Structures are given as C-alpha cells and as structure tokens.
Design a binder for this molecule. Structure first.
Ligand SMILES: Cc1cc2nc3c(=O)[nH]c(=O)nc-3n(C[C@H](O)[C@H](O)[C@H](O)COP(=O)(O)OP(=O)(O)OC[C@H]3O[C@@H](n4cnc5c(N)ncnc54)[C@H](O)[C@@H]3O)c2cc1C
Ligand SMILES: Cc1cc2nc3c(=O)[nH]c(=O)nc-3n(C[C@H](O)[C@H](O)[C@H](O)COP(=O)(O)OP(=O)(O)OC[C@H]3O[C@@H](n4cnc5c(N)ncnc54)[C@H](O)[C@@H]3O)c2cc1C
Ligand SMILES: NC(=O)CN(CC(=O)O)CC(=O)O
Ligand SMILES: NC(=O)CN(CC(=O)O)CC(=O)O
Lengths: 406, 405
C-alpha cells in the first residue's frame, strides 16, 4: 500500500490549510492530499460575482498552485474509508494507508433533489451562487431582470454560509435601485427556516433592512421544483404537509439542498447523519483516535464557514501535535464562526458568533451596523490574506486580535 | 428478471403492499426483495423487554407472510437506478420493473455510540429496538438491585417515538411490584426538548411523570457506553462540548437511526437519504413510477406501523389510478399512532395527523390510561396485524372513526 504519515482528504480550504500546518510538523514528504478538482476556490467571493461586483476568474487558482511545496497531491476521489485498518480507497483503485488522517471533504451540493434541476440552469432568469457553473448565471439574470418576482430560496438542509442566500437578495435589491427598476421588482425570500438568522443581535439588524427595503420573507417555505421552461417555481409549505405553491419569477436564485459528501454518508467515520463524528472541543474523532475532521464535513454544531475552518485549524494543529506525543489535548474549540453579510455594494454586517449562538466580535465597535470598513475587509483584504496567509497555515482564530482590541 | 410491481423490503409496508398489488396485477407479476428469514411485528418487543410477552410470539418466518404466488427474492438491494427502472441485489442480480415500491424501513446504528454494540455482551444494558438485545432489557430489569435506571432517546429520527419512554413506565411499575422502587433513580435522558410532540398526550405523560417521580433530562444525548464500568456518557446539546458521565444499574438504549445505507446515496432519496415522495399521494416526486411507504420515506409524521397501514390504503389507490392513466384523488392525512404502554395494564392510545393534532378513533378521551386500549394493543392488534393488515385488508381507521362517532 502507498502510505503517508499524514493523509489529508480534500484539497479545499480546510484540507490545504491543515496540509500546510502538517508539513511543518512531520515534513512535506510525509503528507499527501487527495483532491480530484483542478481548481481551488475562495468561495466567499461568489456572492459578489453573482452580483456583478467581482470576476469569477479572481476567485480561483489551480489546485497545483496552493498545494504546499513538496506535499504529494493525489488527483483522485476518495471512494471508501476503512479506519479500522487505517486506509482509504480512491477512484484510481489505489489503496492508501496512513498513520494520521485528516478529513476535509466539505459539503455536497444536491441540486438534482430539486425537480427540474440542474437541467433548468440551461434557461435564463435562474442562477445559483453556490456553484462555479451557475454563479455567473445569477448576474446575468440580475442584469436581464425587467419586471416581476425576484425570488431567493433557502433549503431544508444544513448549508455552508447561511448568510449567502440573503446577501444576494440585498445586493439584488440594491442593483434594482441603482438601475431605476426597483419599482418593477417584487422581492421574495422563501426560506425553509423559521427565522432570518440564528443570532438575535444580527437577526434584528437584518429585519430592519427587510422592513426599510420592502422585502417579503415567507418562512417555512421550501423550494421543491423549478419549471425553468415556464419560469415557474413550486414551493412546499413545511408547516402544512401536502400544500404547495406555484409562483412565477423574473429571476430566481437557488440555494441547493446540501448533504455530507456521498463517500462519508455510509462511512464508519460518520455519525448517524453522515457527518464526520468528532469531539466538539478538540476535533479528534470520537471512535478512531488517529482520525481528525475539519470544516463543512464535520458534525461540529456551528455555522459551516471558512472563518470557522481557520479557527478550527488552529485547534486541530494543537490537538494533533499533542496526540503525537501521546498527551491529552487541552485547547478547546469554542465554535467560532463568521458570516460577513454583504448588505449592499458597499456595506457589510460582520456577524461573528460561537457555539452558544452569541456574538463574539473581533472589533470593539458594533458590527451589527452596516459598515463600509467591513465591506472593504471582505471584498479586498480577506481574499488576499486567504491565499497568502490562511492557505499557508498562518491564520487561526481572530481571538488574538479580538483580545488585543479588548 | 422483470416484474410489473417490485417491492423492496419484506417488512410491514412491503408485505402489506405486495398483498394489495397481488390483487391488482396478479401474484405472478409481484416480487419482494427481502434478505431476512424472520418477519416481526415490532411493537410486541416493548412488552418483551418488560417481560410481559415472549419474543417467540413477535415473529414468524418471512416465508409464512409472503402472499401466495408472489416471488420472494431473498437478497439485499444494493443499488437503485430508477432512470433505467432497475435495481441490483447482493446476488449480482439486476431486476427491472414497471413500478417500484420502496419499503426498506429504518436502519439502526448502534455503532455510532462508542462502546456499542460490543457493550451488549455485558450485563445491565438492553435495547428493545433489536431482536438481539430486547431480551437483555428484560434481564436488566430482573437483575436491577440499586442505582440509576437510564432510558435514552437519540438525536435522529426514530420509529415509534413512544417506545423509548414506554419501557421506562413499565420499568417503573416493575420496581413497585418487586419492592425496589425505593432503590431506583429513573431518568429519561432525551435529545429532545419535550416529552411528546402532541400536547394532549404530552400533558398526560407529564402528569404521569410527576406522580411517579420520574426525571426527564432534556437535550441530553447518549454518545458512549462503558459497559464494563456501567457508565454512560451524554452530550449536552444545549452546550456543545459539555458531557456528563453517569453510572447506571440499568441502561436502555434507543439507538441512533438513519435511512438504509443503500438509500443514503440513491437518486430516489432526498438530500437527507429518505425516499422523496409526495406527502399526499406517496408517489415519488421525480420518478413517477416509484413509490415509498413506511419508515424509509420522508413523510413528515411519526414512523409507526399504524402510519404504514393508513399509507397502504392511499398508496393502493395512488398506484391503481396511475395504472388507469388518471391523477390521484385521495390524500394521505399523515395519520399515525403510538399506543403508549404506561403500565402492565394500561395504554394511552395517541393518534394524530400531519398537523400534530389528535385524531382519535374512539369517541372517549384516549389521553387517559385505559385497560381497554392495553388489551387492544397487547392481544387484538397482533392478531389483526398477521391476519388482516398483512393480507391487505387494513388501511386507515377513518371508517371506524366515523362509525364509532
Ligand atoms: C456562495 C458562498 C459564499 C460563501 N461565503 C462565505 C463567507 O463570506 N464567509 C465564510 O467564512 N464562508 C463562506 N462560505 C463558506 C466557505 O466557502 C466554506 O465553509 C469553506 O470552503 C469550507 O471549507 P472545507 O475545506 O470544509 O470545504 P471546501 O473548501 O468546499 O473543500 C472541500 C473539498 O473536498 C473535495 N472533495 C469532495 N468530495 C471529495 C471526495 N470524495 N474525495 C476527495 N475530495 C473530495 C472538493 O473537491 C473540495 O475541494 C461561502 C460558501 C458559498 C457557497
Ligand atoms: C420497539 C418498537 C416498538 C414499536 N411499537 C410500535 C407500536 O406500538 N405501534 C406502531 O404503530 N409502530 C410501532 N413501532 C414501529 C413499527 O414497527 C414500524 O414503524 C414499522 O415496522 C415500519 O414498517 P416498514 O415496512 O416501513 O419497515 P420494517 O417493518 O422494519 O421493514 C423493513 C424491511 O426492509 C428490509 N430491508 C432493509 N434493508 C434492505 C435492503 N437493503 N434490501 C432489502 N431489504 C431490506 C428489512 O429486513 C425489513 O424486513 C415500533 C418499533 C419498535 C422498534
Ligand atoms: N414580510 C414583509 O413584507 C414584512 N414583514 C417582515 C417579515 O416577514 O419578517 C413584517 C413587517 O414588516 O411588519
Ligand atoms: N381471521 C381472519 O380475519 C381471516 N384469517 C383467518 C385466520 O388466520 O384466522 C385469514 C384467512 O382468510 O384465512
């Protein structure tokens, strides 16, 4: 069997970041990354791409260019995990064993659970910022909008970046105003959830925006079907089983149902729901002590964000090092996570919070207010620091800077 | 091989639907894919765990309930390719169909709890949800001397939401009748924030919980069992990262549950792995020749055999009208029932619908503990299950409800 001291499953945000940290602990030649995709994306940029404010090209880099130098890149798809014999399988029929395993497989997009998708993306007026293949379609639908309903969906599953499904609504609302066609747009947010946001301090701020900008939010309404032919969308009422609603749209933004990667759903490393089953403090696996998880694929009960990944990477780095000395971990993850909500082409509400769903703000001023400073940070600073600091393993939590500023 | 109607699963919904469609398309045009040699009426296991009935009475050979002339393919489904109208089995056989009925039930995942299932090799721990552990529940009740009697409820969907607490009420009554109620601290450690999701019966159970000094610990989920040390670890779902290690003299485990593995990645599943069907007609949302019944579906109601029975009448008509190139008319109302055994001689018959509101068959108040309803569940309904439901002659109780009113 091909073998590595540290095997990283997934070459996305968590995988690359952990690979860089592990290169410095065990040496590059002793780390491998299993990743089939040729390109690595900073997916937060896609919110602004779908709003015409950023280029798709700028959100990605070739996977080969972010692989830490000297780390082995296995360009393949994991097809099975056998933790009881410390090995995995790839779709090349290659078997790889490990001393330590880091699982960073992200979350899976399930557009096809929506009837009429993804076939319907071949038609105009429908987009989705959650995929490289549909994010630009959001912008074209926003551009080509003339009159009617502008509908935005939130599915009945876990999601990554719970703020992005509505960020694009606020940007869409602002685009209509600057283009003079706000009068002609009826803006609808049909969300499976019962609340606009899970943290009150920020839910309150967004509700103020919903009121002042004439937005309609229908709660517990989930998209089940798209008739891209007829520009019709069917929504189910989760509170009244059986009841469905057909509504026309002049533009529709779809947030797809999402699930654990297929390979994990049936794996011994998953919990009953398919997520990597790890200690919520240390990120060591609950049942396989040489297995670790990070990012969207875990059952860490916090919002699945890249900011969360960075905080987790600092914790996991310390967990693994301590276990390699057969000591007990002491540093505990607090559920830190962050959704910088873009509320317009020049404003961001920087939501930061923790396992308790209470604010945990880095800056001493009130981040529930729309701010230009926070827009610039997200749109211009954070991508630079992602490629050049986070992916090299030198960005953990902002806890350091939060306590500096008191 | 090809069959007009292919039924996946030879359980409650599978056998029932096979019997009904035998009468629609002919027995020779129906097949059942089911690997298990024994078929169980699982509600009895609640009383087996309490020592009130024998496990032998719970099951019959699978061969004994297959409708005459229907093909029993004793194998395990391993793939579903609905776009080519076929499935694969663990015999490397490929079977095609004109219509597919998916009745694969729910899957139990004891191994997601560290220390299980190997912990069942030790004493003092049982589970009524498995044939291989339900009798261990009864022995744990027997051997209980002094300490904590722990009953759990997981953080996943469940079949029969009432059973995890039914065996607690029976266990309480058993300790009174053996004199050792004084020596038992009895706790229901549940992942949920409520004792029951329908208020009328939630109030009834809460009054029973207070009157018999039972402890309910909400948002507490079993994550590990140290069977050797008789210790059980719970996570606090309200404070991620916090745990609690508890000693037990008796532990009853309700395991985490999930969709069958073969469905988790299947195109017929919704994003969560449940069979994605219309909530009223039970026809699949994306493949119009596919149907779902029972625990494997995403029907948003309690997963119960009574729900299967009501669903079998709707699905029978749904499939019949589709065969006649017509659109289905009759809607499923989400009817389901958990007849809660509250003691060795009493039952709260909870019946409700999609809106989580009571829908009682009888005109009297079923919130009250009743011997009539105990006698019905313990003795009559098993008879009616083997002899009417599994023959396709039991659907919704709607008719009886309207008469009895
Ligand atoms: C539109 C949008 C906007 C967002 N905005 C923000 C934001 O403003 N702020 C924020 O913090 N977060 C945001 N996020 C979330 C952020 O992108 C993710 O949380 C983060 O990328 C998670 O990292 P990860 O490593 O867990 O997964 P990913 O970065 O998604 O990486 C997973 C990797 O696993 C690979 N993989 C999958 N299956 C297999 C397999 N079987 N074998 C091998 N490899 C496999 C994939 O190819 C991928 O490279 C946003 C997300 C979206 C979609
Ligand atoms: C302890 C307990 C007490 C209960 N009490 C009650 C009660 O009082 N009232 C009530 O209404 N309900 C009760 N229930 C629930 C009831 O038993 C179930 O809801 C009912 O059996 C659901 O039927 P089903 O056909 O959907 O699944 P099942 O009856 O479980 O049948 C599923 C079948 O699918 C088969 N199968 C699985 N995977 C595959 C595969 N890959 N290929 C082929 N076949 C496969 C299995 O072998 C099984 O035979 C109770 C359940 C338990 C565990
Ligand atoms: N949905 C709306 O249009 C406005 N709504 C806000 C909401 O739905 O939460 C109520 C209000 O403004 O008083
Ligand atoms: N008891 C009944 O309702 C009919 N039963 C008879 C029985 O098994 O008791 C089935 C049959 O027709 O043979």
């Amino acid at each position: 069997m091909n073998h590595y001291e540290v095997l990283v499953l997934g070459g996305g945000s968590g995988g690359i970041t952990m690979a860089a940290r592990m290169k410095r602990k065990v040496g590059a030649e002793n780390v491998a990354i299993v990743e089939p995709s040729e390109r690595h994306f900073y997916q937060p940029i896609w919110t602004l791409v779908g709003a015409g404010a950023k280029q798709l090209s700028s959100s990605g880099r070739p996977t080969a260019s972010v692989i830490p130098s000297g780390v082995e890149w296995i360009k393949a798809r994991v097809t099975e995990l056998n933790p009881d014999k410390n090995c995995i399988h790839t779709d090349d029929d290659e078997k790889i064993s490990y001393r330590y395993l880091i699982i960073a497989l992200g979350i899976q997009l399930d557009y096809e659970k929506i009837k009429g998708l993804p076939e319907g993306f071949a038609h105009p007026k429908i987009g989705s910022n959650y995929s490289v293949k549909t994010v630009e379609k959001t912008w074209k639908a926003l551009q080509d909008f003339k009159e009617g309903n502008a509908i935005f969906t939130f599915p009945n599953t876990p999601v990554k970046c719970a703020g992005a499904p509505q960020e694009i609504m606020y940007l869409s609302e602002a685009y209509f105003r600057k283009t003079g066609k706000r009068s002609k747009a009826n803006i609808i947010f049909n969300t499976s959830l019962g609340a606009i946001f899970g943290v009150k301090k920020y839910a309150d701020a967004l509700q103020e925006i919903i009121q002042e900008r004439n937005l309609t939010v229908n709660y517990k309404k989930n998209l089940i079907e798209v008739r891209a032919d007829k520009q019709e969308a069917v929504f189910e009422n989760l509170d009244k089983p059986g009841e469905t609603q057909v509504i026309s749209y002049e533009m529709l933004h779809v947030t797809p149902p999402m699930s654990p990667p297929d390979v994990l759903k049936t794996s011994p490393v998953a919990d009953a729901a398919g997520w990597v089953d790890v200690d919520k403090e240390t990120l060591q696996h609950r049942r396989y002590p040489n297995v670790f998880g990070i990012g969207d694929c875990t059952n860490l009960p916090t919002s699945k964000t890249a900011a969360a990944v960075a905080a987790q990477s600092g914790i996991l780095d310390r967990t693994i090092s301590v276990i390699m000395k057969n000591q007990t971990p002491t540093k505990k993850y607090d559920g830190y996570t962050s959704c910088p909500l873009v509320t317009g082409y020049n404003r961001v509400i920087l939501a930061e919070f923790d396992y308790k769903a209470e604010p945990l703000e880095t800056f001493p001023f009130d981040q529930s207010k729309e701010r230009l400073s926070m827009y610039l940070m997200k749109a211009d600073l954070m991508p630079f620091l992602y490629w050049n600091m986070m992916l090299r393993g030198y960005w953990g939590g902002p806890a350091f800077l939060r306590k500096l500023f008191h």
